[PDB]
Structures are given as C-alpha cells and as structure tokens.
Amino acid sequence: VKNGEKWMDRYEIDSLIGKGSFGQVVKAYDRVEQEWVAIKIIKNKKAFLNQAQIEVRLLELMNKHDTEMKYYIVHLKRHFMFRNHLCLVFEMLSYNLYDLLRNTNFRGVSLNLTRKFAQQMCTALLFLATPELSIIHCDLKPENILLCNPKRSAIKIVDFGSSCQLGQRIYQYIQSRFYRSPEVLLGMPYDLAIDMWSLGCILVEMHTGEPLFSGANEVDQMNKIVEVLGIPPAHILDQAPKARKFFEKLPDGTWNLKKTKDYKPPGTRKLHNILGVETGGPGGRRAGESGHTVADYLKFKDLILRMLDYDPKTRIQPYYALQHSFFKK
Numbered sequence: 490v491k492n493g494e495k496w497m498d499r500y501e502i503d504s505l506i507g508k509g510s511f512g513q514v515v516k517a518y519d520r521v522e523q524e525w526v527a528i529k530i531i532k533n534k535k536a537f538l539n540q541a542q543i544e545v546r547l548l549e550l551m552n553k554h555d556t557e558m559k560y561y562i563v564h565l566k567r568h569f570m571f572r573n574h575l576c577l578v579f580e581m582l583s584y585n586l587y588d589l590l591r592n593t594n595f596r597g598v599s600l601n602l603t604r605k606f607a608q609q610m611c612t613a614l615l616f617l618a619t620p621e622l623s624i625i626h627c628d629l630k631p632e633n634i635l636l637c638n639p640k641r642s643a644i645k646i647v648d649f650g651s652s653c654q655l656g657q658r659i660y661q662y663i664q665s666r667f668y669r670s671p672e673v674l675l676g677m678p679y680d681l682a683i684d685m686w687s688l689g690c691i692l693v694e695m696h697t698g699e700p701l702f703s704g705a706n707e708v709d710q711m712n713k714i715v716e717v718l719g720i721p722p723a724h725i726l727d728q729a730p731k732a733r734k735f736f737e738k739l740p741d742g743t744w745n746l747k748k749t750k751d752y753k754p755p756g757t758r759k760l761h762n763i764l765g766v767e768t769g770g771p772g773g774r775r776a777g778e779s780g781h782t783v784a785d786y787l788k789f790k791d792l793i794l795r796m797l798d799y800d801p802k803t804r805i806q807p808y809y810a811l812q813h814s815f816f817k818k
C-alpha cells in the first residue's frame with residue numbers, strides 16, 4: 490500500500506502493523522480526529538468481504554450497548570469502502586499476549602498478571618453473553634488479545650472475523666486448534682461456552698509460557714486433552730457426530746480411546762503438576778515468590794478446571810467465573 494499515501498483527504502498511511510487471512514492492518518494518521526488509528530484492510534474477494542461484513546455488523550451491535558462491561562473489546566471507530574476493499578478503522582492498541590510470552594522466553598508471566606488478564610477476559614465474555622448480543626468470538630488465543638498500552642496490563646480482544654451470534658453458526662470447523670473446545674472437535678452445535686474453553690487454555694499458557702494442548706492435528710489435539718482431563722463423559726460422546734474420529738464405544742455403554750501406533754494414560758497428566766501447585770509453580774521457577782503460594786495456586790487450578798469442563802452445559806459462565814475465590818482480595 491506504501492507509506493505517505495493519503496486516502497480521502499483524511500488518512501495518511503504510515504506502516505504495516507499486521508497481516509491476517511483477512512488482509513492487512515496498517516497504522517494511519519486520521520487528520521479529522523487528530524489521532525493515530527489501525528485500519529484493517531480486507532482483501533478484495535467476495536469470501537473475505539462477506540465475512541468482514543459480518544465482523545462490522547457484530548462490532549456495531551456491541552457499540553450500541555454502553556455499559557462498563559463493553560470496554561474489553563477493541564473499538565471500531567468506523568468503516569468505508571476504498572479501491573474495492575472494506576476498511577475497518579480501530580483505535581490503536583499495543584502488542585499481543587503471544588509477543589508478551591515470546592518476551593518472557595516462553596517462561597510465563599506471574600500468577601498476579603495472569604489474574605489481571607483473567608478478570609478482564611471474563612468481563613469481556615460476560616459482555617458478549619448479553620442476551621441481545623449472544624456473540625461467540627470463536628478464535629480466542631494469545632495473538633487476539635492486545636495490550637492497550639505497553640506500560641500497562643489493560644487488554645482488549647480483537648478479530649471478530651470468525652465470530653457469530655448464537656444460532657447464526659456458519660462453519661463446523663472453527664477456533665485455532667490449540668484453543669479448540671471438545672464440542673467443536675466432536676462436530677457438535679457450539680454456543681458461547683467454546684470461548685470459556687479457549688480462555689482456560691490461554692490462562693494456563695500465560696503462566697507456564699507453553700500451550701496447554703498443542704495438538705499437531707485434531708486426533709493429537711483430543712489425545713492431549715484426554716491426557717489431562719480423561720475420557721469425555723458418555724452423555725457427550727453419545728450425542729457427538731465425530732465421537733468415532735477419536736473414541737470407540739463398547740457393549741457396556743462405555744467409551745475409550747481409539748489408538749494408532751505409539752500419550753500418558755487418560756487423566757494422568759495432572760493440571761496440579763503442570764501448574765506446579767506444590768512444587769514452586771511451572772518448572773519450579775516461582776519457588777518463594779509472593780503471590781505464588783499453594784493456596785493461590787489451588788484457587789487458580791480450581792477455576793481452570795471449571796473452565797475446562799467437558800460439558801458446555803455445566804462449564805463455568807463468565808458471571809460465576811468473576812465471583813470465584815481466585816479473584817477475591
């Protein structure tokens with residue numbers, strides 16, 4: 490697109506910030522508001538335009554709801570068509586939580602900073618669960634969470650490119666694999682609870698430095714989830730179109746893993762040991778640090794296991810996650 494280029498006597502393009510499957514994100518000076526903005530420039534192809542039109546609709550819907558809960562979502566300022574590209578103008582944000590982890594050499598941030606991220610994200614998910622919104626993000630991951638300011642720990646969610654309202658599902662195959670919920674792996678109709686699954690995965694990773702469940706494909710993904718959480722309950726597997734991609738049913742009414750050529754036995758890779766609850770935190774690296782006692786760890790573990798409930802019906806919801814003891818001073 491090229492630095493110094495001027496659009497519509499309003500925006501002066503500075504530089505490329507980001508690239509997506511959707512197109513590209515540039516830093517630009519808005520002469521009207523007299524501020525820098527991020528312009529998301531959608532590719533000029535029907536597929537990308539139509540999905541970006543859904544993104545614009547969902548962001549404008551969120552903007553029509555002024556309440557304290559809405560300020561963890563990136564602000565869409567406006568949109569226009571230019572050179573046959575849909576252009577979405579956002580506020581400028583700082584770097585993303587994956588960059589934050591890369592900056593720790595993938596050793597993770599403190600339980601105290603993890604808590605601050607958890608509280609903001611739970612509040613954002615509470616906002617998206619507003620009945621008249623009922624918005625499923627569908628692609629929550631560290632890269633889609635940006636710092637408001639490189640000096641500060643405030644964050645906002647970006648990229649509603651995959652997002653849909655409850656009952657407006659388009660795709661069966663959604664979410665980034667590492668953050669994909671059991672219900673999506675199993676080909677089942679999904680609801681807002683898939684975002685809470687992603688969040689649980691994200692918070693462990695923010696504190697350990699490493700993805701909780703780093704599957705190389707869907708079969709590997711489900712196997713890595715089963716190592717930590719055991720075989721999913723029969724009532725879920727009995728209703729799951731893709732249950733037999735991963736599992737096999739036996740006369741007893743019971744399920745277990747399909748195996749290929751040579752994972753830890755189901756439920757034996759304990760979150761207790763991944764977090765290092767009794768062993769000084771991840772890799773023992775938090776031994777003796779304040780805010781990293783067994784009691785603080787047990788509360789965190791308890792909240793994560795509620796977020797990683799196999800059953801989307803009983804998986805913790807945002808309001809109840811915010812009332813958890815992990816968040817009590």
Ligand SMILES: COc1cc(-c2ccnc(N)c2)ccc1Cl
Pocket residue numbers: 506507509514527529563579580581582583647648649
């Ligand atoms: C990579 O930097 C940004 C990216 C976005 C962004 C990127 C993709 N989708 C949405 N909705 C927003 C917005 C602001 C900034 Cl600074």
Ligand SMILES: [Cl-]
Pocket residue numbers: 587630631632700
């Ligand atoms: Cl990642």
Ligand SMILES: [Cl-]
Pocket residue numbers: 627628651662663664665
């Ligand atoms: Cl997706």
